[PDB]
């Protein structure tokens, strides 16, 4: 609402550059990683990468290089922004306090110029004589390192060659000499210039230019011996020193284009190479001393490499924009010792609230090609590991208090296989012990404290009752015929074990175990629970059971074992655990199957009647439950492959994910040294600890090995629709199996309508739980899935997946054909309901008020869904250049255009037509569009900018949209969607970006906006930004045609930074304002509640 807050929910994960040197100390080996706005420093150690510092830059890092001028203790850092801020950074550490000083800084932007096609290039003379920059066609900027230039004052040199592919300073030259590949009509060539710092002009190169490969894209300068330059083309690799010409054309590299390289040896004997297909390569140079020959070997397969650097001893870092970045060890083959999560380009995403809880969860289409996946981003509660002790095998855990006087848990019992073990756990120290009266030689089904200062241990063999003042054993109950115990359930007084289908009810009395009720069950007992609700006794009137065979949860009258309620759960999957518990006031029955399905019921301590059935699936593995009391209230822990904590708030169940990997069993443990903590055990280890108050994002990956494009969620079908594209090459076939080919069932478009590597397009039906690919529909040859929608249309009750496409032929620049296709997925079958032919590409679609709204090329049109199951066109709006983006609120439509920016178009139900309401008369290239509310409109610029439009308030000129906001995001936004990752500010929008950063936008009242605005400004003065860049510059809306101060946007990243600043530095900022200290602390803290 004209006042907007933007905060980063997830930093960018993509790596645009990596470099390796001695930055932090002359004797440290450093690895530096630039992730967009983010700079990560590391020290390479004996084992692993020690992280040291991470800093934000106000800008997108274009260039990162370390270099060492004569007279410096250690390497210096040179950075160039994409807004062209230049800086020279030093690493300065005083004690454990650690700062990055700006030694020199300036902005090298030219007022105007033609941005070069292959992009910004930073380079540095091997002698640190100058920094070269090729920013624009026609010029070469020189930043002299000769004198002491603290302002980084630079100057251009006219470059006659107007098309330059790549350039590098050459080693070993009496004056800085650049070598470069450039294109003119007659071809591509490699040329050289000396750079006169006195003449401020170029001089003739040391060696004359030579013709090079038509596709030669990449220049490597070779170190002092051999000298010269190596030039990587798509087909061949050539070497030029100026006296000698060496060229090789390996067949092995023809398949891909080589996009990056790293020198391994300092003498330049070995270079790493990498390509768009993921192949790592080794380039070798054989050897008064000169170069004999070149050789290429294929080292392996890593993430598609944006950039790569060798560290030491066979470990290589892989930066990847397109997918997970890697740390990989070399062998013939390559193994990834480490994997760094990157939500790759987030091409699309959607917010789903599964479990029908309060909270959102994000599912993204991420990466591309080999690296494509879905990522599931959700919030969750982490846990603290105080102790983790290796105990493979744990089949169960129980807390026990041994000393009846002590109110603290002193004993952890662990059941194993044919045995039970007992933990002494004195303080923070845990060691194996024995316990009298307890058998170690059987596996333990249940144990704990019980009535009259006694202990009980149930096993496969007997239920053994134990007096704990003397210890030893008082009573024991075995099955009459001495058969084995199937399942165990016991509360402080009562006990029920089941042997097969048979059931025994026991009570606990002084030095006695009293059997009362007995019965045999229709089918075999699966799980039981007797935990008493409402107490008033300590005796439970009811019994909780579930069975094999019929798969039923049943509640029985405990004394009699008569059946109160039997609910039929259905399906081949049998119940793993059943639990009775109370949240708030209300009584639930919880029963969790072996597939992760957890049903929860309304329970009556009287009827035993289960009412209002509900089910959520958390996890795919059998889920076992344990109750644990956390401070005020009782919570149920759920152990599974997606471990979850379940409780109540506002009298409606809440399921919090837990940021752990997998948990087989758990019990709460509070000891004198481990207070109110939890006992968790997985297949390998038994870990101890507590729940982390603060929620951090948890991320899961579903690798597709092909490219996700759109994704959307069909609730009734309990699955996601996803449009994917795999590449095949010339009939065609893939290089690798991907999600589209792994499908359990699959179909191919039969359409009759329309009649060296090609995209093949699939609609994937994907299960919302297993995330397996249920079905794959493959489109026509040369068909493209563009837009995808899940909705029901017209008076027709069926929910459909609707997909717009285009026919992509090589001969044509924009598609003159395409189609809309209605699919329905029900009863595990993908059905094609209908087709609609269209005169071109369907770039976007949105369900509009029970109608379908699609855009085709220049045309935005509305479809109605007939009683005949078809699409009848209602109205066209033809005034557009390219309509790429659609959003809707009510009868309002927001249309994102390629260049014409945005339009609020409306539907007059009366005339059955379209009327333009208002337009943005500022031309902008749109990435995304969102409607904030009936008035304000959010939009994303091609240039990494955000803006906001608003319906104005007299003449017929009310058709003019005012711009009430402008902000430079620094990220390219692919998708906007309403929703939040949680549960002062109205509204919440999330956005996915190319670098993987996830943002959130929300609205503020003017009173707030202004407060934060001042706070921003005072904060700015006090905070020392890295490159000495100006924050207000950083955020200033900027393009070719415009540069303006950000307005109507508060930078959350900047504001949330106020909590980390020095206590005094805080009081400095506060000062006068418009308010004191802890007041702002309070505010800024609340503002973090939003993500």
């Amino acid at each position: 609402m004209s006042y907007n807050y933007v905060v980063t929910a997830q930093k960018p994960t993509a790596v645009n550059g990596c470099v390796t040197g001695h930055f932090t100390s002359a004797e440290d080996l450093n690895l530096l990683i630039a992730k967009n706005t983010r700079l990560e420093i590391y020290v390479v150690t004996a084992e692993g990468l020690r992280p040291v510092k991470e800093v934000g830059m106000y800008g997108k890092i274009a260039v990162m290089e370390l270099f060492r001028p004569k007279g410096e203790s250690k390497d210096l850092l040179f950075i160039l922004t994409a807004k062209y801020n230049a800086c020279i950074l030093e690493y300065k550490q005083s004690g454990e306090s650690i700062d990055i000083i700006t030694r020199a800084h300036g902005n090298v932007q030219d007022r105007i110029g033609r941005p070069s096609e292959t992009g910004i290039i930073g380079i540095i003379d091997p002698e640190c004589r100058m920094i070269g920059l090729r920013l624009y066609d026609g010029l070469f900027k020189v930043i002299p390192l000769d004198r002491d230039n603290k302002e980084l004052k630079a100057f251009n040199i006219r470059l006659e060659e107007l098309h330059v592919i790549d350039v590098k300073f050459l080693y070993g030259c009496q004056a800085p000499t650049i070598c470069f590949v450039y294109q003119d009509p007659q071809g591509r060539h490699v040329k050289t210039y000396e750079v006169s710092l006195r003449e401020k002009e170029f001089n003739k190169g040391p060696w004359k230019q030579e013709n090079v490969e038509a596709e030669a894209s990449m220049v490597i300068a070779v170190p002092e011996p051999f000298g010269g330059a190596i030039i990587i083309g798509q087909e061949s690799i050539t070497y030029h020193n100026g006296d000698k010409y060496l060229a090789i054309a390996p067949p092995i590299i023809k398949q891909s284009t080589i996009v990056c390289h790293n020198r391994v040896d300092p003498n330049g004997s070995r270079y790493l190479l990498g390509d768009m297909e993921g192949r790592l390569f080794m380039l070798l140079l054989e050897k008064t001393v000169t170069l004999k020959d070149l050789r290429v070997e294929l080292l392996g397969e890593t993430s598609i490499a944006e950039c790569l650097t060798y560290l030491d001893n066979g470990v290589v870092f892989v930066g990847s924009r397109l997918g997970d970045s890697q740390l990989v060890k070399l062998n013939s083959y390559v193994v990834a010792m480490e994997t760094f999560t990157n939500l790759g380009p987030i091409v699309d995403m959607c917010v789903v609230d599964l479990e029908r809880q309060g909270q959102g969860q994000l599912v993204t289409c991420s990466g591309a090609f080999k690296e494509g996946s879905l990522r599931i981003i959700r919030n969750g509660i982490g846990i603290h590991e105080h102790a983790s002790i290796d105990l493979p095998g744990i089949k169960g855990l129980w807390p026990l208090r041994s000393d009846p006087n002590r109110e603290t848990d002193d004993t952890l019992v662990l059941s194993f296989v044919g045995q039970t073990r007992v933990l002494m756990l004195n303080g923070e120290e845990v060691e194996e012990t024995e316990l009298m009266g307890f058998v170690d030689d059987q596996q333990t089904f249940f144990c704990g404290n019980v009535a009259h200062q006694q202990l009980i241990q149930i096993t496969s063999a007997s239920v053994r009752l134990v007096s704990q003042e003397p210890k030893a054993l008082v009573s024991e109950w075995k099955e009459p015929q001495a058969k084995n115990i199937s399942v165990a359930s016991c509360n402080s007084s009562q006990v029920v074990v089941a042997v097969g289908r048979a059931l025994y009810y026991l009570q606990i009395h002084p030095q006695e175990l009293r059997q009362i009720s007995h019965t045999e069950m229709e089918h075999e007992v699966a799980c039981l629970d007797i935990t008493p609700l409402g107490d008033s006794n300590g005796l439970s009137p009811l019994c909780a059971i579930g069975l094999w065979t019929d798969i039923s949860a049943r509640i029985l009258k405990l004394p009699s074992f008569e059946l109160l309620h039997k609910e039929m759960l259905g399906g081949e999957i049998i119940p793993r655990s059943i639990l009775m518990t109370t949240f708030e006031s209300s009584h639930y029955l919880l029963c969790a199957l072996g597939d992760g399905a957890l049903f929860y019921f309304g329970l009556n301590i009287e009827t035993g009647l289960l009412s209002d059935r509900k089910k959520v699936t958390l996890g795919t593995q059998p889920t076992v439950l344990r109750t644990f009391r956390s401070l005020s209230t009782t919570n149920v822990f759920a152990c599974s492959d997606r471990p979850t904590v379940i409780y109540s708030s506002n009298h409606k169940l809440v399921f919090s994910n837990v940021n752990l990997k997998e948990v087989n069993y758990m019990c709460p443990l509070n000891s004198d040294g481990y207070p109110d903590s939890l006992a968790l055990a997985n297949n390998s280890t038994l870990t101890i600890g507590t729940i982390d108050e603060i929620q951090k994002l948890h991320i899961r990956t579903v690798p597709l090995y092909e490219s996700p494009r759109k994704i959307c969620y069909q609730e009734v079908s309990q699955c996601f629709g996803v449009l994917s594209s795999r590449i095949e090459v010339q009939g065609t076939t893939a290089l690798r199996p991907s999600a589209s080919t792994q499908a359990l069932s699959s179909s191919v478009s039969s359409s009759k309508l329309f009649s060296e590597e090609v995209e093949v397009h699939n609609l994937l039906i994907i299960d919302q739980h297993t995330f397996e690919v249920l079905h794959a529909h493959q489109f026509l040859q040369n068909e493209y899935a563009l837009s995808l929608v899940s909705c029901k249309l017209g008076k027709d009750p069926n929910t459909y997946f609707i997909v717009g496409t285009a026919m992509v032929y090589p001969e044509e620049a924009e598609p003159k054909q395409g189609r809309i296709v209605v699919f329905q997925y029900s009863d595990g079958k993908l059905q094609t309901v209908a087709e609609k032919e269209v005169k071109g590409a369907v770039y976007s679609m949105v369900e509009f008020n029970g109608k379908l709204l699609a855009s085709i090329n220049s045309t935005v049109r509305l479809y109605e869904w007939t009683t005949e199951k078809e699409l009848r066109t209602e109205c066209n709006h033809y005034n557009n250049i390219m309509a790429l983006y659609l959003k809707t609120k009510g009868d309002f439509i927001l249309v994102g255009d390629l260049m014409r920016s945005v339009l609020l178009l409306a539907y007059k139900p009366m005339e059955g037509n379209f009327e333009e309401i208002a337009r943005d008369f500022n031309p902008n290239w749109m990435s995304a569009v969102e409607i904030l509310d009936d008035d304000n409109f959010l939009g994303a610029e091609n240039a990494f900018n955000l803006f906001v439009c608003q319906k104005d308030s007299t003449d017929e000129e009310r058709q003019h949209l005012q711009e009430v906001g402008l902000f430079h995001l620094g990220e390219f936004v692919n998708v906007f969607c309403h929703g939040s990752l949680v549960m002062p500010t109205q509204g919440s929008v999330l956005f996915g970006t190319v670098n993987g950063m996830i943002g959130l936008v929300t609205s503020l009242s003017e009173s707030w906006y202004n407060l934060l605005l001042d706070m921003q400004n005072r904060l700015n003065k006090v905070i020392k930004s890295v490159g000495k860049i100006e924050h207000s510059f950083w955020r200033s809306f900027h393009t070719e045609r415009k540069t303006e101060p950000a307005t109507g946007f508060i930078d959350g990243d900047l504001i949330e930074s106020f909590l980390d600043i020095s206590r005094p530095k805080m009081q400095e900022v506060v000062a006068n304002l418009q308010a004191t200290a802890d007041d702002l602390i309070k505010v800024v803290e609340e503002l973090t509640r939003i993500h």
Partner: protein, 365 residues
């Protein structure tokens, strides 16, 4: 196009490369937009057009009829087809209307609320767009061929006025001023242009067959004078340092400001280094220029390739600036094309001609 999207989207290529790269694809697909009309007012042929620099919605025209028209080029409709209606006009009745042909009209840069006109009535008039009344008027001893202001900055208020006199005229919009004179041209100055790039550099072209670049801050002398032979030919004075073999009636700077384009009556177009004034020797072939007055032409901007659009006959010749290839000759007009201006926003083009009509040229596909 689908590739443009999917690339930009997976961030394969830089979003503003694909953007430039598309933009050029469009210029290439340029054709006469028969779906867009411009409302006819001018009774005399259209001598000049200028599209508002920021956001480019409104455009100024001027006629041999001495009228100035102001159009809104935007479309409010449900439809793709529309006319560009004239918002305002300086007409036969307007007290301050020009008496003779209006040769140039230019938006005061950096302030939309004011535009400027020069005429053959020997005046330069400074207008005010809201009030549509005069603001400043300047008079000259001779007819005004070309005027211009610096697109680069607010560091100064100077206008450069080309007149029949051999002296180049610098009028200062701040106060009345204009005692500032550039000397050394021997004939009519038929064109004047400020560098897009440098604040104080101006380029002047004269019937004296010469082109000079000045730093106006200097009391005496120019910076360079364009010699078409790069001085490989030894001439007596009065001969040497000529741009063309005829009147030089056109001037344009390439978008970056690093080169100059001149059109002569010698039927040639030459591209020059804007710094040292060397001839780059780009071909272009024969380009017909017979005009006795000045010749307005323009350059593309914001695309991979830079194009120049120069009126050629009743057509508009499109060339590539650096390469020197003729792309196409845009044909809509039935009589001689006097000027054309480029719409930077959408890659469209607008042309004025002696048929008293303004044609719209938009890219197709």
């Amino acid at each position: 196009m689908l590739g443009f999207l999917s690339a930009r989207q997976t961030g394969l290529e830089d979003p503003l490369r694909l953007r430039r790269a598309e933009s050029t694809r469009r210029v290439l697909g340029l054709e006469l937009n028969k779906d867009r009309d411009v409302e006819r007012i001018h009774g005399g042929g259209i001598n000049t057009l200028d599209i508002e620099p920021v956001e480019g919605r409104y455009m100024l025209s001027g006629g041999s009829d001495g009228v100035i028209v102001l159009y809104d080029l935007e479309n409010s409709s449900r439809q793709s087809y529309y006319t560009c209606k004239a918002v305002c006009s300086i007409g036969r009745d307007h007290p301050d209307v020009h008496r003779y042909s209006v040769e140039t009209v230019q938006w005061y840069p950096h302030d939309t609320g004011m535009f400027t006109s020069s005429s053959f009535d020997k005046t330069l008039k400074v207008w005010d767009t809201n009030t549509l009344q005069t603001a400043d008027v300047f008079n000259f001893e001779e007819t005004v061929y070309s005027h211009h202001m610096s697109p680069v900055s607010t560091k100064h208020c100077l206008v450069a006025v080309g007149t029949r006199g051999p002296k180049v005229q610098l009028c200062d919009l701040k106060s009345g001023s204009c005692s500032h004179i550039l000397q050394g041209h021997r004939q009519e100055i038929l064109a004047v242009s400020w560098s897009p790039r440098y604040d104080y550099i101006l380029a002047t072209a004269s019937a004296d067959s010469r082109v000079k670049l000045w730093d106006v801050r200097r009391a005496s002398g120019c910076l360079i004078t364009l010699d078409q032979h790069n001085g490989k030919k030894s001439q007596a004075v009065e001969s040497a340092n000529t741009a063309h073999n005829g009147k030089v009636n056109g001037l344009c700077f390439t978008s970056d400001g690093l080169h100059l384009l001149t059109v002569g009556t010698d039927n040639r177009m030459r591209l020059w280094n804007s710094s040292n004034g060397e001839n780059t020797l780009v071909n272009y072939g024969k380009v017909c220029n017979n005009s006795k007055k000045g010749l307005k032409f323009t350059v593309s901007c914001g695309c991979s390739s830079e194009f120049v659009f120069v009126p050629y006959g009743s057509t508009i010749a499109v060339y590539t600036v650096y390469s020197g290839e003729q792309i196409t000759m845009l044909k809509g007009h039935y009589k001689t094309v006097d000027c054309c201006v480029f719409q930077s926003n959408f890659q469209e083009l607008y042309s004025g001609s002696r048929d008293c009509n303004i044609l719209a040229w938009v890219p197709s596909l």
